Each structure stands twice: as C-alpha cells, then as structure tokens.
Nucleic acid binder design. Structure first.
Lengths: 339, 107, 94, 300, 176, 78, 179, 97, 97, 80, 105, 95
DNA sequence: TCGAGAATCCCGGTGCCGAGGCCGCTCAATTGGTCGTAGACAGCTCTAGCACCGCTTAAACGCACGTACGCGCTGTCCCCCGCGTTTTAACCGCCAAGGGGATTACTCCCTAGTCTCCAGGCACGTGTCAGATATATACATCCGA
DNA sequence: TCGGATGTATATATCTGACACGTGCCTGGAGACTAGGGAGTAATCCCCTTGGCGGTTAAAACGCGGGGGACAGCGCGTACGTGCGTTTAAGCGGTGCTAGAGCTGTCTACGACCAATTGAGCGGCCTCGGCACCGGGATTCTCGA
C-alpha cells in the first residue's frame, strides 16, 4: 500500500494526552500526559501496557533509546531522569536554568543526550554524571538556538535566532559548513525545528514564515564553509496561509507529511516530484498538538485534546482465503484449461 | 525574450486562464482580481464538466450510439442526486421526462 | 468577414476526447454545455462578490472562491471540488 | 543416531496428557489427565511439585517465557493459570460453552489463542485475561492452533481438512487449503521461515506444503496415522529428522531429504501421542497413552 | 468435392474457397457431411497454415455425436494429441505416441471388407500407430475439432501427394 | 379569437407526456387560461428589453434574459 | 472426556461457510429505462443487497438484507460458460467426488458452470412456489442470466425459482418430480 | 370485432410519449398566438424564428411540470381524474398566486 | 356542570391567536437547540442574543406558511384533519424535495 | 447531548397550528414537524457557520443569519 | 452657493449619498448624472406608498404610533405590494384573520 | 465609537409629510431601513445586468426606467415612471 | 386454464450531408520592469456573554370521560374512451422583393479628477405623557329546558 | 322560545420610561476648471423575413356504443376533545468574572500598467461513414372461451 486514507478509530481512554514519540521498531508509543502520566499501548493487539505516573508536574519532552529500554524525562522543574522498560525507576535529577524545550540522544551511543533551553545555547551532557560540554553558536545575541544530530551521527546541525546554520562536530566543535538562505527579500527569519530521515541524508527546513525547504546532507558538505546552496524542493501554501506546528517524514524517505496548527489538518506531499497529493481532515474545531509517523507501516498518530486518531488504510475483506481454489470473478471468464 | 510557456499547462489544466482573468476584469465584480483565483475557478469548472461528460458518454454507449444527443444529458443530470439538487429549475431543450408510473394506476 | 465570438467549443471538445476516446458530440449539446459553463461562472462570481463586499474588503482572493463553492454546492460534490482546486493551485505554485 | 534411554519417568496415575519442554530449554515437566500437573526435570527427572486444584480433565498445558508461569487447557470450560515458583492458581478463563483442547502464546507472551470445542477461535489475554476477538472458522472442533514465528499468522487445523491461515490485526481469512479427500487434521506447525507447514492428517499419508504457492512437495510412506491427534516435531540437533508420534509402540523419526525407513525407536507399551525435542540437546521426549504411563528419554 | 451447407459448425470462420476450414477459440467440431458408409473412401488433407499451440485431433466420428463434442470423447470418436501423442478414448488418457511435423500432407483411412479393420494412424504412408479395432456399422462423417483458427485445406484427387502405398480405395468423383 | 389554435388533442398529448391516466372536460379551458397568463408575463419583459435596445426585432437573447429573471434558465440558445 | 471416539467426523463438504449465526422508482433498477442502464447498477446493488445464511429446506438459503420492490433485478447468475459435452465429463467427475451439479444453461447449446467459478448466486433453492423468475438479455450480444422479482418482498425471505426426486418445498399443488 | 378494455391504450400512449422527444404543439397556430398577443404591447414587430422556438420550449416544459404536480395532488385525494381545483391548489401552494 | 360542544374553543383559540403578535416558542429550549446543532460544525462558538431572535423569527414564519398550505391541501382532499402525507405532498409540489 | 429535539413540547405545535388556522390534528404531526424543523435549521446553520469561518471570527452575528436567509430566498426585515 | 441637490430637485431623500453608494459598490465603470436623482425619486414614492397605507390601520386600531402589526397588515392587505414583497418574514408580524369555509358548523 | 449609516431621518420626514400628528417606534424604523436597502439593491442589480446585456458600459436614467418597468407590477410602475420623469425634467430645467 | 391475432424488435441494404481535418492568417499574451498602497502583525482596552444562586409559580403533566368522525361497503347512473368515416389545412418546394442589421468614420461634449471651503446630520444628555396596569360592570353566547 | 352563568368590551385612575427635542461639531458634499474618450450620428450594403401558389395526405372532427368510476348514503366504534389536582423548571432579580471584538501604528510584499513578439485559435473548403429510412419475420402480450 501507500499513504493512509480513512479514519479507523481512536483510543479515547487516557484523559489529557499531550505528546507522543516512537522507537526504532514501531511497537512502542509513550505519551507524556498533562500530569506526568507516561502511558504505553500495544499496536498489534492494542492494549494499554504501562502507566508511568512519574512527576506531579506535566511533561513536555521525551525520547526513546537505541536498545529499546531507556527513556528521558522533561518536567516543569527541569528534571531529566533515566528510565527503563523493565523497571521504570528514577535515576537522575537536577535543575537546569528554567526553560527546557527538547532533548535528543546521540544515535550511536546511549551515553550522550543533546539538551536545548530557550534563551541559551544548546547543551550536550552525558549519562554517567553531570558533565556538560559548552556548545558555541555564531550569533550569541538572542541565544534562541535549536540544534539536532544528523542521521548517522557525523555532525550536529544548529539553528540560530537570526537565520544562519552552523555545522559542528560532536566533540571538537569543528565548524565545517555554513549557509544563509535568501529568505524572501529583506528579513531572514528564525528556524522552528529541523528533523532528519532514516534512509539517506535528506532533511527539511521549517522557518517562521511558513515555507518548507528540502535539502540533502551531502550538498552542504560539498559547498563547504560559507557556501550558498539552493533548495532541492520548496513547499508552501497560499490559500489559507497555513501556519505549521509539527514536521516529520515518511517510511523510507518517499513522502513528506506535515501537520498544521489551525484547521486540524494533515498534508502529504512528494519529495520525488514535488506536489501535494492528499488532504486529510478530522474534527473541525480542535487543536493539533503532536504528529508521529509509523516507521514500518503507514500509520499516523495525531493528538488533539487527548484523542489519538490512527489513519489505517481501511482494509477490505473478501473470499479466496476460505476456499483457495475458487476464484471470485467479476464477469464472464470463458476458456479451456488443458490442451 | 525567450519562449513563453502558457498558464494553461503550467498548472496542468485544460480550461484557459487568461480568458477567465479577462472575464473577471471586464465584469466589475470587484476592483482587484487576485493572484490564483482564476486558476482555482478553472479547475472547478474542469471538474464539473468532466463529471457530467462521464455519465453522458456512458449512457451514449449504452443506447448503442456513437454521437451524443441531449436526451443523454437529460438522463445523466436527472438520474443522480447531487446534480438534481443543483440544477433545480432548468429546462433542457429537447429534454424529455423520466419514466414514472404511479402504483395504483396500473392493474 | 464576421466579428469573432467567444465560445467554449474547443475546451469541451478536449475534455471529451480525454475522458471518452471515441464518442463525438453534436451541435445542440455543444450549445447546452456552453450555456451551462456560463451559468455556473455567473453564480460563483456573484456570490464571491457579495462576500467580499460584506466583509469590508476590496479583493477577490482564492479564499472567497473557496467559501462561495462551499456555500453553493451540495455536500459531496463540494468535498471533491475543493480538493481539485487546491491541487491545481499547489501545482501552479512552484 | 545413537539415542539411548537414560531415565524412565513413570508415576502418572492416569493417561499421560502431553510432554512439553521449557521454552528456554531446561525443564521437561509432564502432566496427565488426572487433574494433576507434575513438575519433572529434563536431564535426570528432577521433581519439584504437583499442581492440584482443577475440576475436570486436562488436554493441553503451557508455559511462560521464563518457564515459571503456567496455564492448562482444562476440560471444565476453563483455563486455570498457574505458576512454578509460587504455585498459586492465578486466574481462570471463562467464556467457553464447550471443552477446551489447545492453547498457546504469542512470542511476546501476553496473548492466549483458544481453539476450543465450541469451534469459534477466540483471542484471550494474559495481562487482563480478556477476550479480544473471535475467529468463527470451522463447523468442526479445533484440533490444534499455532502462531507463526513472529506472532502474526494463525493456522487453523480442523476435522474437515481446511488449513486456513488467519489474519491477526483484524482477524480475517487469507487462504484456504483444500484436498480431495476429507481427512481430520491432527497437529500441524509452521517452519523457521514461516513458509512451510508439515501436514499431519488422519489418512496414513503425511504432506509438506509450499505456503507461498499452495502445493505439496515431499511426503512419507509406511506409517500409522489414523486415530488421535498425532503430534509432529522438528530435529536439527542431529540430522534433519522429523520427530512424530506413532500408534504401533514406536516413535516416527525420519529425515526429509532421505524419505526412507532408516531408524525406528521402540520400547513403549501403548500409543505414543506426544513427542518433543529439547531445543539444543539431543533429548527427545516420548510419552504414550494410558496403558504405558512412562517417559522414555532416548539420549544420543 | 464441395462441403456441406447445414451439417456444419455454424460459428466457425467459413472460408470462401469451399475447401478450407478456419476455426475459433474452443473445441467446436465441424462434421463435413460426406463420409463413409461401407467399403472405401480415401482423401487427403493438405495443410496450408498450421501455427503452433494447436490440438488438431483428427479421426472418425458419427452423426450421433454432438457438434460441440471434441473429437476424442467416446467409443465412436478417436483422438490424436499433438503433445506426447496421447490417446483420449472413452475418457482414457494414456501417453501413446510422439508428436507430428508441420507442413506435411495428412490423411486417414479405414479398410473394411463387407469387420476386418485397418484403424491405424496414417501420415504420408508412415505409420504412427495401430489405433483401434472392430467398430460397429453406421455413418462416419469426417470430424474436425481445432484449437486455433488454422488455415488447413483438403484434397480429393486420384493423384495423391503421399498416399498409403498400394491402397484399396474409391475415387471421390462418385459420391461427392 | 385565435386562442383556439391550442386544440383539444394537443393538451391531451401534453398530459400523456405528463403521466396522466384520465382527464375530464374542464381542463382545456383552465389550461388555455394558464398558458395565456404565462405567455403574457414573458412577452412583456421581452418587449421591454427590445424597446430599451432601440430596435424593432425580438431576438433570442432577450427571451433568454426574461426567462432568467423568471427563474427558469433555458439552455441551448446563445 | 477422552473416552469418546465418536462419529460425525466427516464433512464431505468443501463449503464450510455455515456459521453459528444464520441470521434470517427512486433508484435506477426499478425504472422503465432501457436494459443496460439497469445492468450497470446491477453489480453496485447485488454486492450488498442480499445475504446467504442457513435455511431449513437444504442447508444454506438466501435471506436478502433489503426490502426489494416488485419488478426489479436482483443479482446475476454467472460463471464458466461451458459447452455442451464437458457437462457429461463433469457429471462423471463430480459423481466421482461427491458434489452436486450446479449447471444452469443460457440456451440448449451452451451451459453455465457454477462449481468451479462463479459468485454468491449459487444459493438459490428450487421451489414450486417461487417469487422470482428468469429472463436473458442482450448486453451487446454477451447474454446473461439475471433474475428479476415478482411481488413485493420484505427483509428475511428466501428467494427461489422454477428449475423446470421429491422436493423440499411443500407446495399447495406440488409436482414432487423435478423432470 | 375486437375492442380493448379501456385503459390499456392510455398506458401504452403514456409509455410511447415518455420514450421519445419531439414538439407536441403545431407551430403555425402557436406562431399566430405569439404575434397576436405581442400586437398589444408594440405595433409592427418582426420576430425571428429561433425566438418562437425558445418560447415553445419554455411553455411546453412549464406545462409538463404543472401536470406532474397536479397528478400528485389528485392521487393524494384518493381519486384518478384531474379536476381544475387540483390545478388551483398546486398553483396556490407553489407561490405563483 | 357545563362542557362545550367540541370545536367552539378551537374556533375562539383561532381568533385569539390570529389577533395578536407574540412569540410562541419558549426561548431557553430554542436557544439550547441552536447551541446543540451548532456544536457539530465548529466547537466553542459564542452566540449573540439578536441572532437567536432572528432564527426564532425565521423558523416561526416558515412553519406558519407550511401549515397554511397543508390545510389547503387537506380541505381539497374533502377531510378536516391534517395527515403527514399532506405535508409531504406540499413540500414536494413547492420544490423543496 | 441527545434531547431538545423532544424539548419542543406538545402544546406548542398545537399553538402554532392554531395560529395557522388548523381545527383538528392527528397524532403523527408531532414527529413529522420535528423532522421538518430539524432539516430547515440544518440548512440555515450550515451557511451561517460558513460565513463565520470565512470572516475569521469566533461568533455568529445577526447579519450572517440575515445573509443565509437572503440567499435561501426568505428575506428578513428587522435586524439589518 | 450651497444649493444641495435635494433642494435643486425638490426632494426628500439625499442624492450625494446615493451617488456615493453607486460609486463604491462597483456596479459599472462610469455613472451618469441623472441616475441618482431618478433613483431617489423612486425610493421616495415607494416609502410614501407604504406609510400612506399604514396610517389607515394606525387610526383604525385607536393608536397614535405605528407598530409592526400595522406594517404587516398594510403590506399584506394590498394586491401589488403583496407581489413585490413575495416572501419576506417580518419580525413580530402576525398573520391574517383567516378561517376557511367548511370549518364553521 | 464608530459611525453607522442609516435612513432614519428621511423616513421621519416623509412620515411628517403624510401624517402630521403621529410618531413611530424603533422597530418599525429598522424594518423600513431594511426595506429601502432591499429595493435599492434589487433595482441596481437588474440595471447592471441590462447594461451588460446591451454591450455598453454606462448606467443612465433610461436603463433605470427599463429596470423599473421590468420589476414592478402595473399601476405602481406607471406612477413611479411619472414621478421619475417629473423629477428629471424639474432637475434639468433649473440646472 | 388455452389459441388467433396485433404491435415491437431486430437485420439487411442503400445513400448522403454534416462532423472532421487541413490551411492560412491575424490580435493579444507574455515577459520584463516599474510604483504605489492594502493588509498583516502586535498591543492595549472594556463590555457583552457565560456562570452561580435563590424564590415563586404558570403551566406541563397524567388521567378520567364520552362523541363525532373516518372508513368501509353498496348502488346507480352517467360520461369519457375506442374506432371508423369523411374533410381541410399543415408541410414542402418554390420564387421574388427590400428594410433593417451590421459596420466605419468623424467630431465633441460629459464625466473623472483634483482641490478648497462649509453646514448638517450624528452621538449625547433631559423632561413628559401614550400606554401598560389595575377595578368594576353591561351583555352576549352557549347549552340546557 | 326562554334562562342562568362566565368572558369579554367599555369606562376611569396612576405611573413610568421610550420618544421627542436641544447642542457641539467634524467630515463629506458642493463649486470651478480641465482631458479625452465613449458614444452620437451620417452612410452603405446584402440577406434574411415576409408574402404567395400549387399539390399531397396526415391529422382532425363527428357519431355510436357501454361499462367503470364518482358520489350519495348508512352503520359503527374509537381516537381525540374538555376539565381537575400537582409538581417543576421557566422566569426575574442580583452579583461576578473575562475572552474576545474593536481601534491603531508600520511596513513590505503583491498586483495594475506599457511595449513587442510570437503562435494558438478561428474562419473557410473537401469528404466520407454513421445514422436516416425502409422491407421482412420471429417474439410477446391480450382477451374471450
């Protein structure tokens, strides 16, 4: 099959769901609720697995690990704790400066996580102790800087508060590539969040003036430090003018999905050709919060005030599994069998 | 100075776009006609024309014919529900009616 | 020596030869389809003009055409036509 | 090739129900139809305890992933859930209107397939113990059920001779295996790739099925497969032997490349109906019916 | 010798040269209305266009048989399969002989003194097999059941192409 | 006068198209009345358009515009 | 309990469809329109209009799930259009296998098979008190076997027709011989 | 010597006229009617032919719609034959009077 | 101990209600009905009061016109009491269905 | 919510009919009238919410109700 | 020199606001000069007609103040105004005192 | 604190011409406001479609006259045409 | 329940004129660049909309009793349908004549546009009197007698 | 034909807050003068619209007969009025909070306009093949027995 088309139920059991993320395999989905409750379901038989009522405080960020065992907490008292899918116990606890927005593990080692505050440069720590490596950003003026790893674990792409991208190394801070995009005609605007694929090196640019640009993780390294690349594909909307909230990718780098922030909508483009091909809808007056794509099957999970809807292709039953020798034809099929 | 590709196949359509934009300028519908509104409108007109010509051509084949005469358009409009709700007060010339004998008349 | 007349014969002819590769169309059905296209154009443009006059604006954008189509067409046919128009605008965009 | 008897584990007061090893491969506990489930060893016959607290008979018994938590297919329309390390009768599965003959687990070990004699294959849980779905497959009672390797497909073996394969997500038929004769299918299972199923039907002719296409490939001759639910196994520890039960005081064990009569074990005194191999060792379990009441572990 | 007007399979491609049968998709068997009663009637069958993937079952059949009977259905109809020469007579499938070449001059014959039989596969005077033996007496119109629409002609002259050598026959200038 | 041109079989054939089984003998007078009323209410607006155009000939587009104002919208002309 | 080597362990049935339940002019197909216009909408109706469940007459019957009005089409009886002497070979073959004959003929030159290839239209029993009949139409020469109705039929009734052995209908003036 | 039971010829006339499409009013009396009632609004007019055709089409479609709604009213009144009070009821419900 | 012959109280109710002008539907259930069926097109709306008044006026005028045309149909059918098939006939003649 | 289609009571339809001039009422008119009123309110409220969401507000002013009624063909004087 | 056009035609409805509404509404390209005077005359005649027919029922119901019941009666009791206002719902309107033929005993 | 435009004072003046000894409430004034706007927009729309039908681009008193004779019923149309013609002549005589 | 007969439906044959395509030849679409302002964005405000609370009470409700109406059957009588015979103007082919529709050229005066100056219509603030609310009372309508 | 009882219309007393009226003012309408372009009006031409004449037949008109529906009546039994105690939420006031509609300052990104070049679209002229028309025989539905 391909991209989903039909509604296919929900899970309206847990009250006040807020965020969601997957593992590598596509069978683990934890939900940081509005009160610290962390709930996992099943996907094959769809039963509630484990409620982790960790904090008295709400949760704003989570992430899974490579072994399929470890998680990471982000409450409203800056608590980052190491969890387990066997026990589910608290390990680490300390206080940052007050804002914490999103965390991200290192891909090829579960030692290091990359933590991002609001009004500071993003900080990388370890999980052995409270060691933190100071990351330098080029502007250091507003300090509203986002940062993320690439796919394989080569570099760290960072995004400032002014519209310039730095490419650093994970330990020695090797500035090896940089680029400024010609944002419209006068103002260069900030970047919300940059996410990365699973097959290849393609990624997306999500600005603050509602334009999605498509790039590769090799062309910028070819252009070196202070080069001017072009967008591989420009994605935008004109009719409803369409603010965005959440961005992610399809299964093996085929399509691109991006949930909206106004009309409770889901749009599916094509990275290959470059045109919109399907519009989804739902409840007319809700508020879309978090969108997660399923890595080995076309399933999209969307949180809008607790409700998690699962667009799941609407399979169609038929014959020929009961009696595999009878073929249910459509019209007159005449022939002779054996010459 | 180079070649100029039209606005009819830059979007992959069939109905013209410059003629629609001229008819929105020469009509005094408003002052300032926007950017892509004639493209949107020409796509809508394409969709409706394709929708009605599908049923028209299908009935034209099913009456063992090759051309189309307006009886087929009468049948194709008045059979469906949605087009009957749209085209309420319209008399197609040479149209004819749909067969409907009541329950109590025939023996 | 005649004055030119605007029409829609070639465009109906093209869409017919796309969707049915054999079937021809006579004169009277061509006149009927011409009048039908002009009729739906008049209704949609008039409703969009009344909207843009209501909201203290001066500009017929695509958004008013969308709201006019949603007000005028009944249900499922509107749900198809809005998606057809949005696909056309997105292909024209880049 | 040189399987030799080490220990004879007799002591069952009624007909020995089934011999099933531990899934992690360290136990061989044996139960009987006497409403009593004992905990025996696999290498010396090390005894632990006897389960008591049933109401009617026992057809099938099962295990856990750590070989402690237990459940049995009880014949009072129940499936009482048990344990080795604590022994408490954990739960009891209602929802049956007829006897229960077989039950198994997905490899994730939190679901219970239930092909019972009420002929509608239900889908039960371990954590909640809840009937998820229902597969109304056959008009005949279920002989055996089995998941595939990952836990995504269920085979249906029944009296009519229709080896259908069923979906797990929404529960629908995908294919129906058919035959000119109408033999009762006794006990089948999948392959380590999920693309082969050895057929054990009551016609004195085994079959091996090409799953992806739907044809038979390699068979056997000269065997007694007529009466009961005769079990079949695998063997990769020695050669590619096919361990199977036998009604003539033997254990049907032959290779499938050869398709010959090369080795015939003997010593039982009743119809051998349940066999199983240790997953790594050269241990073949064997326990016949009521007139034998013994366990013969022929060790290479 | 001309063919029939009514005693024929109607939906076959009737050729205008009146000496060539052209078939259809399926086994709809034409029985040309000029066949034996007693003694001897020999004719040859010249083959013009024999494409591959054809089952040209040739032989003898009666007007008791169905028009939609494939030649090789019962004890009256005979069978000669292309692939592996197999006979299908009284619904009995036994792989009998080999195949046959393309572009020869075919033709079958029965020898019955008024019975002692020569029901033997005949092809350019070369034997492919002794077919059957000791029929009952009746009417045996020639039967043609084909799988493709193959252009195959027919011969009636006394100067044959490859006749059975030293043949007892009768010329087709008497009853046809 | 010449309202008698709409004869007795013509109203009968129109009612056979309408799907009517049996007709009494007053419908002819009622039908000629209703037809005369409708043709007056169309030809009035057609003659108004023609007098506004400063011409002396009734065209087809004027009749189509009058039928559009009535709310009936004939296709197949213009 | 493990003491019953009990019979009724043979089915002789390839169709084990029978389950526990056995629940028993606005459109185009009831118009006066020409025939292929109804023949198109035939398939869009017949996939969901009726159902097949267990009947007391002979196994599985045909209980429709929609209030069918009188005069309209219901469903088509289609399959392998066999030609007239393969019928006898299949009679011998299904005599050898033990499955009954499912052969309706369009004309007396070509018959239509149902056992090897077909649809859900096989579950129509013979009765001497029918409420349906059969007419063959000409959809561009490719003729069909389509079943009309006779009277006003409600939800939960078996549909039968005359096929032209004692019958299991129990009619008021039954013939009891299906030849 | 055969006469049909009354009604059958009516039913086959209904089917025969609902089959085909034609014009059911002779064009010379209709043309003289149009000139006659156009005489009183402006003297010495001059019609085209297609305008007469358009008026004939519009009048025929209006009459057929009126007869269908009238027959619905009469079948509601548990009768068969149309009376003129049914025509007056239909024209008063529709809003034209 | 006096009871009127049935019909007279109906006639004086007809005269008494056709005299005056008021609103005949209680405004709290009508307001809850408007919010109830407006919930399914957009969540969390917020009505003014005059809009509710305008909807009440339009609905009441439409219902009164429908009942007048229905009573004309029923008096045509030589009866007194309104049946719902009269309502369906009126709505089918007017063109709304 | 489920009720308030039944919250329209049953002297009220009687009082509307006796403003309209109705003498004797059967016992089916209640549910028939509920159905008709529900259909009409749907076909007004849908265009009202359309004009609202096009205007980019979050309330439903009286002028939108007047415009929807005006396009349906039922003009209302007294609120514009 | 401040001769308003309402005085220069001798009217009551103003002309400058009507010309402003015909320039603002985008009805055509150019607007003439006699058209708003003509249109204000027509609107004056219609309003005078409606108020003249309202005054009769205003005096007949023993009132000195026009009410919507008076406007409803004054519109619906005419013939040609009842065709011009073909379907218009008036708030607080009320209906005509109508009772049919066969209802009375 | 914004300006809304209406027709209250002019209806008030015409009322004081035709009935010199009465007053009017608010609801009747709002009804008359809506009536005047309705008739205005209907006549303007009909005149605009006429002007586009005749392939010209100017709205004059001639088109407003043809719009009125097409729109109103008889006697009211004749009186309104006489009123408009008198107003045009008395306007253009003292220009 | 049967047979003779009457319209429809299909097949074969002719033939001809209007769809279909080619060819040439023009007007407006397009790009490329300029210039001006309509609308988006943010920030402050203050007021109608939604909620809590409690008291009184019109009316909504449920349950008695009759009775007038809806309906179903029966008769009869009358009038619309089906067919056959006689008649007349609808339809077509045909020609002649000329009046108005259609197009071009050429002045030209009618409205757009810009500014400067003023008065009139609108929001806001106060008295007062038509009507809303009571009491009391002729008489008139209805069902009983 | 006549009588008692409630409901309504008629006549007066008392309050009260919408309606009518007086004021400040700012912004929109009038006065003067110009540009040029849409329209007004003469001028010519050609074909489509009116008018008629003769022949043919398809349709129209007029009688004659009868059985099938419209309507009047009558019997009955029943579903919906009219009236009496209660209970309940509808309605009126009083108090309280705030989301959201509305104004207001800036700017920049997007649409109208000008000149040329192209080239797709429309007008005109052959030409056949799908349908128009028509004789022939099988099929199917009617109605008296």
């Amino acid at each position: 099959q391909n991209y989903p088309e039909e509604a296919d139920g929900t899970l309206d059991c847990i009250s006040m769901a807020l965020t969601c993320t997957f593992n590598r395999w596509g069978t683990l989905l934890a939900v940081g609720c509005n009160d610290g409750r962390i709930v996992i379901w099943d996907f094959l038989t769809r039963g509630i697995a484990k409620i982790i009522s960790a904090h008295i405080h709400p949760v704003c960020s989570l992430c899974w690990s490579r072994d399929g065992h470890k998680l990471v907490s982000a409450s409203t008292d800056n608590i980052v704790s190491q969890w387990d899918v066997l026990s589910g116990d608290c390990d680490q606890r300390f206080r940052f400066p007050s804002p914490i927005l999103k965390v991200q593990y290192h891909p090829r080692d579960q030692n290091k996580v990359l933590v991002c505050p609001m009004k500071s440069a993003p900080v990388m720590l370890t999980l052995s102790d409270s060691k933190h490596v100071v990351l330098p950003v080029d502007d250091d003026s507003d300090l509203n800087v986002v940062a993320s790893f690439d796919r394989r674990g080569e570099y760290i792409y960072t995004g400032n508060a002014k519209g310039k991208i730095l490419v650093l190394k994970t330990d020695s801070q090797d500035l090896v590539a940089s680029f400024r995009v010609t944002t419209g005609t006068s103002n260069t605007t900030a970047i919300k969040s940059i996410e990365f694929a699973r097959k290849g090196s393609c990624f997306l640019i999500n600005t603050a003036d509602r334009i999605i640009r498509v790039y590769d993780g090799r062309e910028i390294l070819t252009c070196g430090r202070d080069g001017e690349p072009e967008p591989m594909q420009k994605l935008q909307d004109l009719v409803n003018r369409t603010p965005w909230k959440k961005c992610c990718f399809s299964g093996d780098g085929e399509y691109i999905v991006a949930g909206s922030a106004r009309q409770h909508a889901l749009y599916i483009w094509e990275k290959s050709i470059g045109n919109l091909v399907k519009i989804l809808h739902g409840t007319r007056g809700e508020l879309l919060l978090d969108v997660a794509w399923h890595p080995v099957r076309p399933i999209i999970a969307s949180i809008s005030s607790g409700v998690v809807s699962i667009w799941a292709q609407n399979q169609v039953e038929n014959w020929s599994a009961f009696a595999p020798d009878f073929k249910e034809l459509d019209e007159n099929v005449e022939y002779e069998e054996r010459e | 100075r180079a070649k100029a590709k039209t606005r009819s196949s830059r979007a992959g359509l069939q109905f013209p776009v410059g003629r629609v934009h001229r008819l929105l300028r020469k009509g005094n519908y408003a002052e300032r006609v926007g950017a892509g509104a004639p493209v949107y409108l020409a796509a809508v007109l394409e969709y409706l024309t394709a929708e009605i010509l599908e049923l028209a051509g299908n009935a034209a084949r099913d009456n063992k014919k090759t051309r189309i005469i307006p009886r087929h358009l009468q049948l194709a409009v008045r059979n469906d529900e949605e087009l009957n709700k749209l085209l309420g007060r319209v008399t197609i010339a040479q149209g004819g009616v749909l067969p409907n004998i009541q329950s109590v008349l025939l023996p | 020596r005649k004055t030119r007349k605007e029409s829609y014969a070639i465009y109906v002819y093209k869409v017919l030869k796309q969707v049915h590769p054999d079937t021809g169309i006579s004169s009277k059905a061509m006149s009927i389809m011409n009048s039908f296209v002009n009729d739906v154009f008049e209704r949609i443009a008039g409703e969009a003009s009344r909207l843009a006059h209501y909201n203290k604006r001066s500009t017929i954008t695509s958004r008013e055409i969308q709201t006019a189509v949603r007000l005028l067409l009944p249900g499922e046919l509107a749900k198809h036509a809005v998606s057809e128009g949005t696909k056309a605008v997105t292909k024209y965009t880049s | 090739p040189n399987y030799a008897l080490k220990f004879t584990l007799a002591g069952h007061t009624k007909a020995v129900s089934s011999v099933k090893f531990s899934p992690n491969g360290e136990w061989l506990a044996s139960s009987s139809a006497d409403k009593l489930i004992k905990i025996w060893g696999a290498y010396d016959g090390k005894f632990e305890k006897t389960i008591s607290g049933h109401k009617l008979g026992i057809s099938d018994v099962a295990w856990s992933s750590d070989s402690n938590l237990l459940v049995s297919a009880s014949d009072d329309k129940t499936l009482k859930i048990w344990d080795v390390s604590s022994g408490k009768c954990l739960k009891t599965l209602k929802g049956h209107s007829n006897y229960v003959f077989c039950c198994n687990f997905n490899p994730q070990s939190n679901l219970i397939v239930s092909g019972s004699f009420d002929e509608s294959v239900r889908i039960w849980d371990v954590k909640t113990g809840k009937c998820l779905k229902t597969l109304p497959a056959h008009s005949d009672p279920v002989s055996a059920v089995h998941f595939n390797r990952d836990g995504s497909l269920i085979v249906s073996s029944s009296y009519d001779g229709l080896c259908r394969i069923w979906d797990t997500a929404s529960g629908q038929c995908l294919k129906t295996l058919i035959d000119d004769d109408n033999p009762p299918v006794s006990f089948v299972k999948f392959s380590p790739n999920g693309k082969y199923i050895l057929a054990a039907t009551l016609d004195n002719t085994l079959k091996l099925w090409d799953y992806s296409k739907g044809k038979c490939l390699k068979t056997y001759t000269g065997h007694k497969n007529e009466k009961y639910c005769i079990f079949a196994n695998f063997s990769v520890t020695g050669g590619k032997w096919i361990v199977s039960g036998s009604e003539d005081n033997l254990v049907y064990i032959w290779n499938l490349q050869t398709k010959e009569i090369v080795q015939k074990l003997q010593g039982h005194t009743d119809v051998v109906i349940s066999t199983a191999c240790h997953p790594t060792e050269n241990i073949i379990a064997s326990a016949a019916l009521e007139n034998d009441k013994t366990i013969k572990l022929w060790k290479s | 010798v001309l063919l029939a007007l009514h005693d024929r399979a109607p939906q076959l491609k009737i050729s205008d040269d009146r000496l060539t049968v052209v078939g259809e998709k399926g086994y709809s068997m034409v029985r040309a209305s000029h066949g034996v009663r007693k003694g001897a009637w020999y004719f040859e069958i010249t083959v013009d266009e024999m494409p591959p993937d054809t089952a040209a079952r040739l032989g003898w059949s009666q007007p008791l048989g169905n028009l939609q009977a494939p030649l090789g259905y019962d004890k009256f109809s005979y069978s000669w399969r292309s692939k592996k020469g197999t006979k299908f007579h009284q619904s009995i499938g036994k792989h009998y002989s080999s195949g046959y070449g393309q572009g020869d001059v075919l033709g079958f014959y029965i020898n019955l003194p008024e019975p002692h039989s020569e029901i033997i596969f005949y092809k350019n005077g070369v034997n492919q097999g002794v077919a059957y033996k000791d029929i009952f007496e009746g009417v045996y119109f020639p039967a043609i059941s084909l799988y493709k629409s193959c252009t195959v002609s027919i011969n009636f002259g006394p100067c044959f192409k490859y006749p059975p050598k030293d043949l007892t026959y009768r010329p087709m200038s008497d009853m046809g | 006068d010449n309202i008698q041109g709409i004869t007795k079989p013509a109203i009968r054939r129109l009612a056979r198209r309408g799907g009517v089984k049996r007709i009494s003998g007053l419908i002819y007078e009622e039908t000629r009345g209703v037809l005369k009323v409708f043709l007056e209410n169309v030809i009035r607006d057609a003659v108004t358009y023609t007098e506004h155009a400063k011409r002396k000939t009734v065209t087809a587009m004027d009749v189509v515009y009058a039928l559009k104002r009535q709310g009936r919208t004939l296709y197949g002309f213009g | 309990a493990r003491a019953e080597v009990h019979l009724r362990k043979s089915a002789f049935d390839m169709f084990n469809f029978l389950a526990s339940k056995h629940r028993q002019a606005r459109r185009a197909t009831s118009m006066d329109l020409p025939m292929p216009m109804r023949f198109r909408h035939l398939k869009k109706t017949s996939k969901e209009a009726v159902g097949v469940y267990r009947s007391p007459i002979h196994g599985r019957g045909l209980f429709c799930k929609r209030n069918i009005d009188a005069g309209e089409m219901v469903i088509e009886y289609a399959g392998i259009v066999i030609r007239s002497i393969l019928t006898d070979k299949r009679e011998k073959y299904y005599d050898s296998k033990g499955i009954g004959c499912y052969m309706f003929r369009i004309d007396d030159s070509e018959v239509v098979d149902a056992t090897m290839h077909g649809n859900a239209a096989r579950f129509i029993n013979h009765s001497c008190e029918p409420n349906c009949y059969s007419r063959v139409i000409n959809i561009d020469g490719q003729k069909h076997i389509v079943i009309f109705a006779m009277r006003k039929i409600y939800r939960g009734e078996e549909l039968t027709y005359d096929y032209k052995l004692p019958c299991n209908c129990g009619a008021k003036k039954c013939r009891k011989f299906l030849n | 010597p055969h006469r049909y039971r009354p009604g059958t010829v009516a039913l086959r006339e209904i089917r025969r006229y609902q089959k085909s499409t034609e014009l059911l009013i002779r064009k010379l009396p209709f043309q003289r009617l149009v000139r006659e009632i156009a005489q009183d609004f402006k003297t010495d007019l001059r019609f085209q032919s297609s305008a007469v055709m358009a008026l004939q089409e519009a009048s025929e479609a209006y009459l057929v719609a009126l007869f269908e709604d009238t027959n619905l009213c009469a079948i509601h009144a548990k009768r068969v034959t149309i009376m003129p009070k049914d025509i007056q009821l239909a024209r008063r419900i529709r809003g034209e009077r």
